[PDB]
PDB file of all heavy atoms in Angstrom:
ATOM      1  N   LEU A   1     -37.551 -17.424  54.112  1.00  0.00           N
ATOM      2  CA  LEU A   1     -36.341 -18.201  53.997  1.00  0.00           C
ATOM      3  C   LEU A   1     -36.352 -18.995  52.771  1.00  0.00           C
ATOM      4  O   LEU A   1     -37.408 -19.539  52.290  1.00  0.00           O
ATOM      5  CB  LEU A   1     -36.300 -19.130  55.261  1.00  0.00           C
ATOM      6  CG  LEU A   1     -35.097 -20.039  55.535  1.00  0.00           C
ATOM      7  CD1 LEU A   1     -33.814 -19.233  55.611  1.00  0.00           C
ATOM      8  CD2 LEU A   1     -35.352 -20.756  56.881  1.00  0.00           C
ATOM      9  N   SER A   2     -35.181 -19.140  52.108  1.00  0.00           N
ATOM     10  CA  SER A   2     -35.019 -19.851  50.856  1.00  0.00           C
ATOM     11  C   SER A   2     -33.708 -20.593  50.761  1.00  0.00           C
ATOM     12  O   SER A   2     -32.628 -20.030  51.005  1.00  0.00           O
ATOM     13  CB  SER A   2     -35.074 -18.815  49.733  1.00  0.00           C
ATOM     14  OG  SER A   2     -34.944 -19.357  48.454  1.00  0.00           O
ATOM     15  N   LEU A   3     -33.776 -21.891  50.420  1.00  0.00           N
ATOM     16  CA  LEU A   3     -32.621 -22.729  50.187  1.00  0.00           C
ATOM     17  C   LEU A   3     -32.652 -23.213  48.739  1.00  0.00           C
ATOM     18  O   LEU A   3     -33.711 -23.735  48.299  1.00  0.00           O
ATOM     19  CB  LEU A   3     -32.624 -23.885  51.155  1.00  0.00           C
ATOM     20  CG  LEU A   3     -31.561 -24.997  50.936  1.00  0.00           C
ATOM     21  CD1 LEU A   3     -30.158 -24.497  51.134  1.00  0.00           C
ATOM     22  CD2 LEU A   3     -31.789 -26.197  51.892  1.00  0.00           C
ATOM     23  N   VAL A   4     -31.497 -23.098  48.093  1.00  0.00           N
ATOM     24  CA  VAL A   4     -31.310 -23.644  46.717  1.00  0.00           C
ATOM     25  C   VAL A   4     -30.043 -24.525  46.673  1.00  0.00           C
ATOM     26  O   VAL A   4     -28.908 -24.061  46.868  1.00  0.00           O
ATOM     27  CB  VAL A   4     -31.193 -22.540  45.678  1.00  0.00           C
ATOM     28  CG1 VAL A   4     -30.771 -23.110  44.349  1.00  0.00           C
ATOM     29  CG2 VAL A   4     -32.497 -21.812  45.562  1.00  0.00           C
ATOM     30  N   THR A   5     -30.242 -25.827  46.480  1.00  0.00           N
ATOM     31  CA  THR A   5     -29.214 -26.742  46.030  1.00  0.00           C
ATOM     32  C   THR A   5     -29.634 -27.615  44.845  1.00  0.00           C
ATOM     33  O   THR A   5     -28.973 -28.570  44.504  1.00  0.00           O
ATOM     34  CB  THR A   5     -28.743 -27.670  47.206  1.00  0.00           C
ATOM     35  OG1 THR A   5     -29.885 -28.363  47.697  1.00  0.00           O
ATOM     36  CG2 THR A   5     -28.061 -26.863  48.241  1.00  0.00           C
ATOM     37  N   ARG A   6     -30.785 -27.323  44.258  1.00  0.00           N
ATOM     38  CA  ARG A   6     -31.340 -28.068  43.163  1.00  0.00           C
ATOM     39  C   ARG A   6     -30.986 -27.257  41.856  1.00  0.00           C
ATOM     40  O   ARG A   6     -31.175 -26.059  41.786  1.00  0.00           O
ATOM     41  CB  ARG A   6     -32.862 -28.177  43.310  1.00  0.00           C
ATOM     42  CG  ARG A   6     -33.626 -28.727  42.133  1.00  0.00           C
ATOM     43  CD  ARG A   6     -35.119 -28.754  42.446  1.00  0.00           C
ATOM     44  NE  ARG A   6     -35.870 -29.231  41.238  1.00  0.00           N
ATOM     45  CZ  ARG A   6     -37.165 -29.047  41.111  1.00  0.00           C
ATOM     46  NH1 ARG A   6     -37.884 -28.506  42.018  1.00  0.00           N
ATOM     47  NH2 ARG A   6     -37.739 -29.488  39.978  1.00  0.00           N
ATOM     48  N   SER A   7     -30.561 -28.013  40.865  1.00  0.00           N
ATOM     49  CA  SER A   7     -30.179 -27.373  39.620  1.00  0.00           C
ATOM     50  C   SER A   7     -31.417 -26.620  39.030  1.00  0.00           C
ATOM     51  O   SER A   7     -32.528 -27.171  38.963  1.00  0.00           O
ATOM     52  CB  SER A   7     -29.708 -28.429  38.614  1.00  0.00           C
ATOM     53  OG  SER A   7     -29.367 -27.791  37.402  1.00  0.00           O
ATOM     54  N   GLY A   8     -31.159 -25.379  38.638  1.00  0.00           N
ATOM     55  CA  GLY A   8     -32.219 -24.561  38.039  1.00  0.00           C
ATOM     56  C   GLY A   8     -33.099 -23.818  39.028  1.00  0.00           C
ATOM     57  O   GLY A   8     -33.847 -23.012  38.580  1.00  0.00           O
ATOM     58  N   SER A   9     -32.987 -24.104  40.306  1.00  0.00           N
ATOM     59  CA  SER A   9     -33.819 -23.406  41.255  1.00  0.00           C
ATOM     60  C   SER A   9     -33.285 -22.006  41.546  1.00  0.00           C
ATOM     61  O   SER A   9     -32.080 -21.752  41.326  1.00  0.00           O
ATOM     62  CB  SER A   9     -34.043 -24.197  42.534  1.00  0.00           C
ATOM     63  OG  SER A   9     -34.881 -25.270  42.414  1.00  0.00           O
ATOM     64  N   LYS A  10     -34.202 -21.138  41.990  1.00  0.00           N
ATOM     65  CA  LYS A  10     -33.879 -19.720  42.199  1.00  0.00           C
ATOM     66  C   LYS A  10     -34.538 -19.253  43.462  1.00  0.00           C
ATOM     67  O   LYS A  10     -35.560 -19.811  43.868  1.00  0.00           O
ATOM     68  CB  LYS A  10     -34.434 -18.889  41.000  1.00  0.00           C
ATOM     69  CG  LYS A  10     -33.791 -19.201  39.654  1.00  0.00           C
ATOM     70  CD  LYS A  10     -34.436 -18.383  38.513  1.00  0.00           C
ATOM     71  CE  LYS A  10     -33.734 -18.746  37.217  1.00  0.00           C
ATOM     72  NZ  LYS A  10     -34.542 -18.327  36.034  1.00  0.00           N
ATOM     73  N   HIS A  11     -34.002 -18.220  44.040  1.00  0.00           N
ATOM     74  CA  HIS A  11     -34.594 -17.675  45.335  1.00  0.00           C
ATOM     75  C   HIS A  11     -35.851 -16.804  45.034  1.00  0.00           C
ATOM     76  O   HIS A  11     -36.931 -17.209  45.370  1.00  0.00           O
ATOM     77  CB  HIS A  11     -33.571 -16.851  46.117  1.00  0.00           C
ATOM     78  CG  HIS A  11     -32.451 -17.675  46.597  1.00  0.00           C
ATOM     79  ND1 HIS A  11     -32.613 -18.615  47.564  1.00  0.00           N
ATOM     80  CD2 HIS A  11     -31.109 -17.677  46.288  1.00  0.00           C
ATOM     81  CE1 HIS A  11     -31.452 -19.213  47.814  1.00  0.00           C
ATOM     82  NE2 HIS A  11     -30.526 -18.697  47.019  1.00  0.00           N
ATOM     83  N   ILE A  12     -35.677 -15.644  44.429  1.00  0.00           N
ATOM     84  CA  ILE A  12     -36.796 -14.790  44.146  1.00  0.00           C
ATOM     85  C   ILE A  12     -36.653 -14.155  42.780  1.00  0.00           C
ATOM     86  O   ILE A  12     -35.514 -13.779  42.376  1.00  0.00           O
ATOM     87  CB  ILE A  12     -36.986 -13.669  45.225  1.00  0.00           C
ATOM     88  CG1 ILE A  12     -38.371 -12.953  45.018  1.00  0.00           C
ATOM     89  CG2 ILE A  12     -35.808 -12.774  45.322  1.00  0.00           C
ATOM     90  CD1 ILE A  12     -38.947 -12.252  46.217  1.00  0.00           C
ATOM     91  N   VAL A  13     -37.749 -14.113  42.046  1.00  0.00           N
ATOM     92  CA  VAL A  13     -37.828 -13.423  40.772  1.00  0.00           C
ATOM     93  C   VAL A  13     -39.034 -12.593  40.725  1.00  0.00           C
ATOM     94  O   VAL A  13     -40.082 -12.806  41.401  1.00  0.00           O
ATOM     95  CB  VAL A  13     -37.769 -14.457  39.585  1.00  0.00           C
ATOM     96  CG1 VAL A  13     -36.544 -15.327  39.632  1.00  0.00           C
ATOM     97  CG2 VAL A  13     -39.042 -15.311  39.547  1.00  0.00           C
ATOM     98  N   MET A  14     -38.934 -11.553  39.870  1.00  0.00           N
ATOM     99  CA  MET A  14     -40.038 -10.729  39.357  1.00  0.00           C
ATOM    100  C   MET A  14     -40.843  -9.995  40.536  1.00  0.00           C
ATOM    101  O   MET A  14     -42.041 -10.054  40.556  1.00  0.00           O
ATOM    102  CB  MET A  14     -41.029 -11.605  38.579  1.00  0.00           C
ATOM    103  CG  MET A  14     -40.359 -12.125  37.301  1.00  0.00           C
ATOM    104  SD  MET A  14     -39.931 -10.866  36.066  1.00  0.00           S
ATOM    105  CE  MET A  14     -41.515 -10.159  35.744  1.00  0.00           C
ATOM    106  N   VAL A  15     -40.088  -9.323  41.394  1.00  0.00           N
ATOM    107  CA  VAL A  15     -40.618  -8.443  42.389  1.00  0.00           C
ATOM    108  C   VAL A  15     -40.223  -6.998  42.160  1.00  0.00           C
ATOM    109  O   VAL A  15     -39.056  -6.754  41.804  1.00  0.00           O
ATOM    110  CB  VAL A  15     -40.347  -8.962  43.805  1.00  0.00           C
ATOM    111  CG1 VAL A  15     -38.898  -8.838  44.206  1.00  0.00           C
ATOM    112  CG2 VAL A  15     -41.233  -8.233  44.784  1.00  0.00           C
ATOM    113  N   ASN A  16     -41.138  -6.070  42.268  1.00  0.00           N
ATOM    114  CA  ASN A  16     -40.870  -4.624  42.229  1.00  0.00           C
ATOM    115  C   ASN A  16     -40.615  -4.116  43.661  1.00  0.00           C
ATOM    116  O   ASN A  16     -41.546  -3.975  44.365  1.00  0.00           O
ATOM    117  CB  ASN A  16     -42.038  -3.883  41.571  1.00  0.00           C
ATOM    118  CG  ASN A  16     -41.813  -2.438  41.380  1.00  0.00           C
ATOM    119  OD1 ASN A  16     -40.986  -1.842  42.074  1.00  0.00           O
ATOM    120  ND2 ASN A  16     -42.565  -1.824  40.451  1.00  0.00           N
ATOM    121  N   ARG A  17     -39.354  -3.891  43.985  1.00  0.00           N
ATOM    122  CA  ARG A  17     -38.963  -3.534  45.393  1.00  0.00           C
ATOM    123  C   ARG A  17     -39.370  -2.111  45.672  1.00  0.00           C
ATOM    124  O   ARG A  17     -39.368  -1.744  46.830  1.00  0.00           O
ATOM    125  CB  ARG A  17     -37.516  -3.753  45.614  1.00  0.00           C
ATOM    126  CG  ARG A  17     -37.134  -5.232  45.583  1.00  0.00           C
ATOM    127  CD  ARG A  17     -35.633  -5.447  45.464  1.00  0.00           C
ATOM    128  NE  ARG A  17     -35.305  -6.871  45.376  1.00  0.00           N
ATOM    129  CZ  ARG A  17     -35.135  -7.652  46.409  1.00  0.00           C
ATOM    130  NH1 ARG A  17     -35.256  -7.244  47.662  1.00  0.00           N
ATOM    131  NH2 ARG A  17     -34.837  -8.942  46.201  1.00  0.00           N
ATOM    132  N   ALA A  18     -39.699  -1.243  44.658  1.00  0.00           N
ATOM    133  CA  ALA A  18     -40.192   0.103  44.940  1.00  0.00           C
ATOM    134  C   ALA A  18     -41.700   0.115  45.217  1.00  0.00           C
ATOM    135  O   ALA A  18     -42.259   1.169  45.631  1.00  0.00           O
ATOM    136  CB  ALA A  18     -39.914   0.964  43.747  1.00  0.00           C
ATOM    137  N   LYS A  19     -42.401  -0.911  44.800  1.00  0.00           N
ATOM    138  CA  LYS A  19     -43.844  -0.944  44.950  1.00  0.00           C
ATOM    139  C   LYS A  19     -44.323  -2.079  45.875  1.00  0.00           C
ATOM    140  O   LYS A  19     -45.484  -2.135  46.196  1.00  0.00           O
ATOM    141  CB  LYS A  19     -44.634  -1.069  43.595  1.00  0.00           C
ATOM    142  CG  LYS A  19     -44.300   0.116  42.720  1.00  0.00           C
ATOM    143  CD  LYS A  19     -45.319   0.307  41.582  1.00  0.00           C
ATOM    144  CE  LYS A  19     -45.115   1.716  40.939  1.00  0.00           C
ATOM    145  NZ  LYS A  19     -46.235   2.033  40.057  1.00  0.00           N
ATOM    146  N   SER A  20     -43.463  -2.956  46.257  1.00  0.00           N
ATOM    147  CA  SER A  20     -43.719  -4.019  47.211  1.00  0.00           C
ATOM    148  C   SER A  20     -42.740  -3.800  48.393  1.00  0.00           C
ATOM    149  O   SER A  20     -41.606  -3.416  48.139  1.00  0.00           O
ATOM    150  CB  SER A  20     -43.469  -5.383  46.580  1.00  0.00           C
ATOM    151  OG  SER A  20     -44.454  -5.662  45.618  1.00  0.00           O
ATOM    152  N   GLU A  21     -43.176  -4.256  49.575  1.00  0.00           N
ATOM    153  CA  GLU A  21     -42.308  -4.201  50.741  1.00  0.00           C
ATOM    154  C   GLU A  21     -41.590  -5.513  50.854  1.00  0.00           C
ATOM    155  O   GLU A  21     -42.253  -6.532  51.124  1.00  0.00           O
ATOM    156  CB  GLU A  21     -43.088  -3.890  52.040  1.00  0.00           C
ATOM    157  CG  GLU A  21     -43.693  -2.467  52.077  1.00  0.00           C
ATOM    158  CD  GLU A  21     -44.739  -2.290  53.164  1.00  0.00           C
ATOM    159  OE1 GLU A  21     -44.433  -2.690  54.360  1.00  0.00           O
ATOM    160  OE2 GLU A  21     -45.828  -1.807  52.917  1.00  0.00           O
ATOM    161  N   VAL A  22     -40.282  -5.541  50.632  1.00  0.00           N
ATOM    162  CA  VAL A  22     -39.500  -6.763  50.655  1.00  0.00           C
ATOM    163  C   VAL A  22     -38.474  -6.554  51.714  1.00  0.00           C
ATOM    164  O   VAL A  22     -37.473  -5.830  51.513  1.00  0.00           O
ATOM    165  CB  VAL A  22     -38.865  -6.975  49.245  1.00  0.00           C
ATOM    166  CG1 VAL A  22     -38.170  -8.372  49.244  1.00  0.00           C
ATOM    167  CG2 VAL A  22     -39.916  -6.975  48.209  1.00  0.00           C
ATOM    168  N   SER A  23     -38.622  -7.257  52.875  1.00  0.00           N
ATOM    169  CA  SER A  23     -37.788  -6.972  54.067  1.00  0.00           C
ATOM    170  C   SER A  23     -37.473  -8.265  54.806  1.00  0.00           C
ATOM    171  O   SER A  23     -38.348  -9.129  54.956  1.00  0.00           O
ATOM    172  CB  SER A  23     -38.320  -5.928  54.946  1.00  0.00           C
ATOM    173  OG  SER A  23     -39.557  -6.309  55.508  1.00  0.00           O
ATOM    174  N   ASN A  24     -36.299  -8.331  55.384  1.00  0.00           N
ATOM    175  CA  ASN A  24     -35.879  -9.409  56.231  1.00  0.00           C
ATOM    176  C   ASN A  24     -36.049 -10.789  55.664  1.00  0.00           C
ATOM    177  O   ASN A  24     -36.521 -11.696  56.302  1.00  0.00           O
ATOM    178  CB  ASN A  24     -36.469  -9.324  57.673  1.00  0.00           C
ATOM    179  CG  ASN A  24     -35.709 -10.120  58.677  1.00  0.00           C
ATOM    180  OD1 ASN A  24     -34.513  -9.992  58.744  1.00  0.00           O
ATOM    181  ND2 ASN A  24     -36.401 -10.995  59.498  1.00  0.00           N
ATOM    182  N   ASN A  25     -35.677 -10.964  54.406  1.00  0.00           N
ATOM    183  CA  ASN A  25     -35.692 -12.261  53.719  1.00  0.00           C
ATOM    184  C   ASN A  25     -34.291 -12.768  53.585  1.00  0.00           C
ATOM    185  O   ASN A  25     -33.377 -11.979  53.276  1.00  0.00           O
ATOM    186  CB  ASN A  25     -36.330 -12.151  52.326  1.00  0.00           C
ATOM    187  CG  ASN A  25     -37.760 -11.658  52.394  1.00  0.00           C
ATOM    188  OD1 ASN A  25     -38.710 -12.377  52.803  1.00  0.00           O
ATOM    189  ND2 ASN A  25     -37.964 -10.392  52.030  1.00  0.00           N
ATOM    190  N   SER A  26     -34.140 -14.058  53.674  1.00  0.00           N
ATOM    191  CA  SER A  26     -32.759 -14.693  53.651  1.00  0.00           C
ATOM    192  C   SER A  26     -32.038 -14.318  52.353  1.00  0.00           C
ATOM    193  O   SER A  26     -30.831 -14.103  52.350  1.00  0.00           O
ATOM    194  CB  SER A  26     -32.802 -16.168  53.861  1.00  0.00           C
ATOM    195  OG  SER A  26     -33.417 -16.816  52.807  1.00  0.00           O
ATOM    196  N   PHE A  27     -32.792 -14.233  51.211  1.00  0.00           N
ATOM    197  CA  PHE A  27     -32.199 -14.109  49.970  1.00  0.00           C
ATOM    198  C   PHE A  27     -31.582 -12.748  49.676  1.00  0.00           C
ATOM    199  O   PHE A  27     -30.837 -12.566  48.723  1.00  0.00           O
ATOM    200  CB  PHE A  27     -33.153 -14.528  48.843  1.00  0.00           C
ATOM    201  CG  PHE A  27     -34.556 -14.020  48.967  1.00  0.00           C
ATOM    202  CD1 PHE A  27     -34.860 -12.700  48.796  1.00  0.00           C
ATOM    203  CD2 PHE A  27     -35.607 -14.855  49.255  1.00  0.00           C
ATOM    204  CE1 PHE A  27     -36.127 -12.192  48.898  1.00  0.00           C
ATOM    205  CE2 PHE A  27     -36.876 -14.401  49.383  1.00  0.00           C
ATOM    206  CZ  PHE A  27     -37.167 -13.060  49.198  1.00  0.00           C
ATOM    207  N   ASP A  28     -31.922 -11.766  50.564  1.00  0.00           N
ATOM    208  CA  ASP A  28     -31.345 -10.442  50.427  1.00  0.00           C
ATOM    209  C   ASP A  28     -30.229 -10.173  51.477  1.00  0.00           C
ATOM    210  O   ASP A  28     -29.727  -9.049  51.557  1.00  0.00           O
ATOM    211  CB  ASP A  28     -32.393  -9.371  50.554  1.00  0.00           C
ATOM    212  CG  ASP A  28     -33.388  -9.364  49.419  1.00  0.00           C
ATOM    213  OD1 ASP A  28     -33.025  -9.679  48.242  1.00  0.00           O
ATOM    214  OD2 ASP A  28     -34.588  -9.056  49.694  1.00  0.00           O
TER     215      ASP A  28
END
């Protein structure tokens, strides 16, 4: 889970979705 209301904040960066399992996250 990820919340952003702060200036300059980000949810997710720099993940390879073909080589990492990225599932059931709020940011997607």
Side-chain angles (χ1 to χ4, degrees):
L1 183 57
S2 181
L3 171 64
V4 173
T5 56
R6 172 180 177 197
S7 182
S9 286
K10 295 177 181 163
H11 294 294
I12 191 159
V13 302
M14 297 294 299
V15 68
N16 183 335
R17 295 164 182 274
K19 298 198 168 192
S20 292
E21 293 168 49
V22 186
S23 64
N24 201 49
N25 301 285
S26 66
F27 45 71
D28 293 327

